[PDB]
Amino acid sequence: MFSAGHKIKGTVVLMPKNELEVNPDGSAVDNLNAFLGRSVSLQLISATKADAHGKGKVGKDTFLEGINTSLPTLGAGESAFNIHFEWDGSMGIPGAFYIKNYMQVEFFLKSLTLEAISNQGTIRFVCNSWVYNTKLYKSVRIFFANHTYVPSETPAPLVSYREEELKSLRGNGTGERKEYDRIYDYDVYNDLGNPDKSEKLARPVLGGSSTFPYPRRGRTGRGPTVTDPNTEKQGEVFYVPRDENLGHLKSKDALEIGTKSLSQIVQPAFESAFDLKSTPIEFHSFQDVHDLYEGGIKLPRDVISTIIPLPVIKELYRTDGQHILKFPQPHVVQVSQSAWMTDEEFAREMIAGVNPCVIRGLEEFPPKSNLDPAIYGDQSSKITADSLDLDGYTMDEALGSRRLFMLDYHDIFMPYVRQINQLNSAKTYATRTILFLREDGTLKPVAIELSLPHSAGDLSAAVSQVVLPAKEGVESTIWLLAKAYVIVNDSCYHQLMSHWLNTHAAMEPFVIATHRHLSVLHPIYKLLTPHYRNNMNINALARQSLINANGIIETTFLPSKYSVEMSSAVYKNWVFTDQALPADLIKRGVAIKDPSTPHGVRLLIEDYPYAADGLEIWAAIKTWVQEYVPLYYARDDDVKNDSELQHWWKEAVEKGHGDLKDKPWWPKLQTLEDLVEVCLIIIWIASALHAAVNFGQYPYGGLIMNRPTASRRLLPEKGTPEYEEMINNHEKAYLRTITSKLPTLISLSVIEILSTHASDEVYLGQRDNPHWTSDSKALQAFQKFGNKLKEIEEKLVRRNNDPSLQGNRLGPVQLPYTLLYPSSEEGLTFRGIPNSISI
Ligand SMILES: [Fe+3]
């Protein structure tokens, strides 16, 4: 009965821990009824009625009453609970709530729904957050209703709560971070080396210096190593704010745990098989490589037994359960097993492959170098115009008609060649490949320059050289090897720069800044956060097993211990505004500004799959951001006066990407134009850019010959048995040059995991909850965005089905370019654009 205290009917949906992360000895059930009694209490907070302090009034401690089992639309191992609050109309309208978990074990709170049949009828709270036992928290967990507000629009009673929650999220910059902590802060990459285990595992700190600038990462606070105070000590779990590590109902969907298992468990098992000489140490012919996805590879019983039961890992190979591991057939060989060897495919993959964003237009000949000849010797190119086959065109005609392009790794790799070549089993060249756009619209490679630095007293007699296309004799073998050296350069740049640096590492500082300065009520927070899903989690796991000293990348890629620092050298030239698709195309000389076109740019290679499909996605995102922003910012002054926004941007730049705060190109955030730009670029990088460079890894690189990760020797001298091998056994010559069999098994496994779409992925044009905001306007705009993406996909399908575009969109491998199709089912699909860098 009501006595100046009326009742509000509410429903709590939560997931018991044994749902998102289960294992036999991890189901401490204590079913539904244990959540009753005095186990969980919530308190409504008023958004309209305030106390003597200006803070909204707080209701009574209310405990769950019972298990609600009414609506079908409730899945994912979720449970609904009935609860009633004593909230008289005088208490105003609830806009938030406190929650205390008195149980020992934490649970995952999905939402609260107040069916307050009066005003708006229904008040919704989308929580999606783990609630640990109350004794573990310094302050009570607070959640807000799904309303959106810029700081100036926050209801007065909620103003203090909004700011306190942000202060809580920031922490104070000290202390070892714990599992239940939700503290976002920055730190340099000083956690990769392992000096305490060995001086050989000591690595330079990346970030915080002019020698090694680098984006910041999430602070973990484990403390100094015993031997080095600048290096953070080892830890079995690399912390990420609690909700950044949400589980999966299905174990097979926890793809990010794969790298740890592969490095620590699978790799040592593979190694033993080789140490015991139970399998040939090297591939002896191309068929030995093809065998991996056909009949498979035979390994010792206990190596199969070590692999076969592991979650995620067991999904990577088919097995007989005793001796065979069989990898899935890579997309690149599904129609033709030899097409990867063609010059047509080599050039096509530069515009439609795994790394379609490095090629540049060449407007002068010969190509020039900006490196010091005093250090590296004469840097003039040795490629002669007269030696090239440009389909009848003269050099001047090719240059003027904008038909000359290049894949230039000369200046990028030259500074590292000497030190990489001093390593055992690592030999590389700083390569440059010249390409010509034929009249038929396809690209053809016309020359490759294999350069080596030359200094006084060089012990090595190896010299630089230019290799030209050849289809027969030893010359054809030399040209095939030349393409291999180029792809090793490309694979390394792709893995470390196009992929790791530009997406994973560049985005983390924005994730941290967003949680530290934009409240969950903020429209820009709601706009950006979906594009951060799993990013910090995958990054922390990467720092621990992928990019760490002796981790997966160092043990499978050419640069070895120099891998990650090379990406710091490249970061010196990373420009935020150049990450925008149009600016990138223009900067690389593959497109020119053209106001008369729909996208504002004219492509110099009209059928450049990545760029043409990408511009369509870029346009759809821009339209969405341009429609969303106005809903909350009427004029430029509103942007300038948003305190959270200014704080967020100031920190993202001066702290997150602090080593480059001194650059002239950082956008200011004083106008509506600036805001749309920064958000558009962030969303682009997290979704489409990452998808384009990530999901083709196994599809193209699943055949080691197509995408070698390392080279082990330079070209042989004419009078040596190695030279004789090129003439007599070119397959063996090729295999001895590229990645060895053991590291191949490990790298194929990693890229297989990274190219897989978890079944619980949230794609571009999707949100994890249909009530992310109460604002119907923002909800309409998002609907248009999704409809437009479906429209774009129909168009890309037509492009792939158009025979006149077969040369660049399909190639001799007959693999339709689907990497930029917005949607996809689960698996290794070669399509689908996730909202974020989630793997
Ligand atoms: Fe990735």
* DSSP code string of 472-483: SHHHHHHHHHHH
Catalytic-role residue among 331, 494, 499, 531: 499
The contacts of residue 2 (CB under 8 Å, 6+ apart) are none
Distance of CA 655 to the CA centre of its chain: 21
In angstroms, what is the span from residue 686 Cα to ligand 1's centroid? 10
CATH number of the structural domain 168-267: 4.10.375.10
3-state SS class at 610: helix
The 10 Å Cβ neighbour count of residue 110 is 21
Catalytic residue list contains 515 = no
130 near 192, Cβ under 8 Å? Answer: no
690 is in an annotated binding site: yes
- In the block, residue with structure tokens 């000389």: 589
Nearest to 489 by CA among 433, 434, 447: 433
In angstroms, what is the span from residue 301 Cα to ligand 1's centroid? 33
CATH number of the structural domain 268-356: 4.10.372.10
Q: What is the separation, in whole angstroms, between the first and last Cα of the chain?
A: 54
How do the domains of the chain map onto residue ranges?
Answer: 9-167, 168-267, 268-356, 357-490, 491-839
Task: Give me the amino acid identity at 356.
Answer: P
3-state SS class at 80: strand
What is the CATH class of 9-167? mainly beta
Half-sphere exposure (Cβ direction) of 344: Cα atoms closer than 13 Å? 15
In angstroms, what is the span from residue 695 Cα to ligand 1's centroid? 8
Distance of CA 438 to the CA centre of its chain: 34
The contacts of residue 396 (CB under 8 Å, 6+ apart) are none
Catalytic residue list contains 6 = no
Q: What's the length of the chain?
A: 839
Q: Write down the architecture of domain 491-839 according to CATH.
A: Up-down Bundle (1.20)
3-state SS class at 536: helix
Q: For the purposes of burial, counting CB atoms within 10 Å of the CB of 825, is it exposed (0-12), middle (13-18) or buried (19 or more)? A: exposed
Catalytic-role residue among 410, 494, 504, 517: 504
Give the pairing of strands 186-187 and 66-68.
unpaired
CATH number of the structural domain 357-490: 3.10.450.60
- In the block, residue with structure tokens 């492509």: 603
716-729 in b/e form (b: 16+ CB < 10 A) is beeeeeebebbeee
508 near 539, Cβ under 8 Å? Answer: yes
Catalytic-role residue among 515, 531, 657, 690: 690
Nearest to 83 by CA among 109, 120, 55, 106: 109
The contacts of residue 535 (CB under 8 Å, 6+ apart) are 244, 504, 507, 508, 511, 686, 836, 837, 838
Cα 93 from Cα 75, distance rounded (Å):
30
The DSSP symbol for 133 reads: B
Give the pairing of strands 217-218 and 186-187.
antiparallel
DSSP bridge pairs for 11 = 82, 113
410 is in an annotated binding site: no
Cα 521 from Cα 47, distance rounded (Å):
13
Catalytic-role residue among 146, 537, 694, 835: 694
E strand segments, 441-511: 443-451, 465-467
* DSSP code string of 161-183: HHHHHHHHHH--S-S---TT---
**Elucidation technique:** X-ray
Cα 388 from Cα 380, distance rounded (Å):
17
CA dihedral 542, 548, 554, 556 (to 10 degrees): -40
Catalytic residue list contains 504 = yes
Task: Give me the amino acid identity at 665.
Answer: W
The contacts of residue 1 (CB under 8 Å, 6+ apart) are none
The contacts of residue 788 (CB under 8 Å, 6+ apart) are 620, 623, 624
Cα 52 from Cα 318, distance rounded (Å):
67
In angstroms, what is the span from residue 754 Cα to ligand 1's centroid? 7
Q: Two tokens at 301?
A: 């019983």
Cα 641 from Cα 635, distance rounded (Å):
10
532 near 514, Cβ under 8 Å? Answer: yes
781 near 767, Cβ under 8 Å? Answer: no
In angstroms, what is the span from residue 789 Cα to ligand 1's centroid? 22
The 10 Å Cβ neighbour count of residue 597 is 13
331 is in an annotated binding site: no
What is the dihedral sign for C-alpha 261, 263, 267, 268?
Answer: negative
Cα 196 from Cα 233, distance rounded (Å):
8
504 is in an annotated binding site: yes
Cα 642 from Cα 638, distance rounded (Å):
6
E strand segments, 281-397: 297-298, 318-319, 324-326, 360-361
Residues lining ion ligand 1 (Cβ < 5 A) are 694
In angstroms, what is the span from residue 56 Cα to ligand 1's centroid? 43
Resolution of the experimental model, in Å, one decimal: 1.4
270 phi and psi, to 5 degrees? -60, -50
In angstroms, what is the span from residue 744 Cα to ligand 1's centroid? 19
274 near 742, Cβ under 8 Å? Answer: yes
Catalytic residue list contains 690 = yes
* DSSP code string of 237-302: S----GGGS---SSGGG-GGGHHHHIIIIIHHHHHHHHHTT-S-SS--SHHHHHHTTTT-EE--HH
Cα 73 from Cα 339, distance rounded (Å):
49
> What angle is formed at CA 267 by the lines to CA 264 and CA 268, rounded to 5 degrees?
80
683 near 528, Cβ under 8 Å? Answer: yes
Q: Two tokens at 381?
A: 């190119």
